[PDB]
Design a binder for these strands. Structure first.
Ligand SMILES: O=c1ccn([C@@H]2O[C@H](COP(=O)(O)OP(=O)(O)OP(=O)(O)O)[C@@H](O)[C@H]2O)c(=O)[nH]1
Ligand SMILES: [Mg+2]
Ligand SMILES: [Mg+2]
Ligand code: NA
Length: 327
DNA sequence: CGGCATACG
DNA sequence: GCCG
């Protein structure tokens, strides 16, 4: 079992679901307390379990696995012995965890805002609605639409959206293309949002595109919220439903075709997979990876990639399709 | 011990 | 919290 998640396939469904979910609760709780390092270790240990070929049934099977030390091993030990880990259950029912989860789930509210509201005594969404003067417009939209945004987006919803985005993109710039990224590209059946990547085959033609796309979607009455030159937009869309509609989060990113493999890799995820790949690139290969390119800081050169396959090869890694990047 | 991913809105 |  290699130490980095980008060195091993991780499928969407696996054989250690209960154990991985428990460790992810502790990772989430560590993030709420500001401990990025603890969050990473618990996330990494969970991801190791997702990569195993069969269920863990005995503690001895953790011996030698990366990211299992005294704490994560004890958690697994208790789940194997009793079906429950007391530390996890204590976190689950705690007011701090439940409120921080509730608040950070809001579009426009992160850990720091949630923590400040928690310390001020706020606990419920109606607590926030009663003091709307303390909310940004983004937070107001996230709070108004919170119920719909709490409903999973279905793969059935994604096809309909991609068609309307393609129509607007085609009027804004004929020949421009729309690619589904994020969790749906990794094979997820549900999501919290829909993520799209837009480009054009002629380098440079994509400049100025996203404002033209957003103006056209807004004119069609499909935009319930957006932030407005720019190249990323995090929006709330109106999606049709039987006799009505629902609000859906949609993310649009524009990249030049020269950078498209890097952007596709970066926005396909998973989040942990990309953090691990970027850490691997820098620490093991001395190369700096981001959504624009792969930089050699010694030669001061960028690696020209024509595909995601090219990027894995340049990092010395076996290629993983998106469905195996579910770290 | 240091390190823990990344850049745009 | 764990790795190197
Ligand atoms: O902190 C972050 C968030 C997101 N991303 C990059 O953006 C992509 C989309 O980020 P999303 O938050 O949309 O996640 P997801 O699609 O993987 O899962 P859902 O909760 O939406 O079902 C992620 O898969 C990752 O590639 C990061 O690199 N870092
Ligand atoms: Mg997504
Ligand atoms: Mg998204
Ligand atoms: Na949030």
């Amino acid at each position: 079992m290699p130490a980095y998640a980008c060195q091993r396939p991780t499928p969407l469904t696996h054989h250690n679901t209960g154990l991985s979910e428990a460790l992810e609760i502790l990772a989430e709780a560590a993030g709420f307390e500001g401990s990025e390092g603890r969050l990473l270790t618990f996330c990494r240990a969970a991801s190791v379990l997702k990569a195993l070929p069969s269920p863990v049934t005995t503690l001895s099977q953790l011996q030698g696995l990366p990211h299992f030390g005294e704490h994560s091993s004890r958690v697994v030990q208790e789940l194997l012995e009793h079906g429950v880990c007391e530390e996890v259950e204590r976190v689950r029912r705690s007011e701090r965890y439940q409120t921080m989860k509730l608040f950070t789930q809001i579009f426009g509210v992160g850990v720091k805002t949630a923590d400040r509201w928690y310390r001020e005594g706020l606990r419920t969404l109606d607590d926030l609605r009663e003091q709307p003067q303390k909310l940004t417009q983004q937070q107001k939209a996230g709070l108004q639409h919170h119920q719909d945004l709490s409903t999973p987006v279905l793969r059935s919803d994604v096809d309909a959206l991609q068609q309307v985005v393609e129509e607007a993109v085609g009027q804004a710039l004929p020949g421009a293309t729309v690619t589904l990224t994020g969790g749906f590209r990794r094979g997820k059946l549900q999501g919290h949002d829909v993520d799209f990547l837009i480009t054009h085959p002629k380098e440079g033609q994509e400049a100025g595109l996203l404002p033209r796309v957003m103006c056209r979607l807004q004119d069609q009455g499909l935009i319930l919220y957006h932030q407005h030159a720019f190249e990323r937009s995090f929006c709330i869309f109106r999606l049709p439903q039987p006799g009505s509609w629902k609000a859906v989060r949609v993310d649009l990113v524009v990249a030049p075709v020269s950078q498209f493999p890097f952007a596709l890799l970066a926005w396909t995820g998973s989040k942990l997979f990309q953090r691990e790949l970027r850490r691997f690139s820098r620490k093991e290969k001395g190369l700096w990876l981001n959504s624009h390119g792969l930089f050699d800081p010694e030669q001061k050169t960028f690696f020209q990639a024509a595909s995601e396959e090219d990027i894995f090869r340049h990092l010395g890694l076996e290629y993983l399709p998106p469905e195996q990047r579910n770290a």
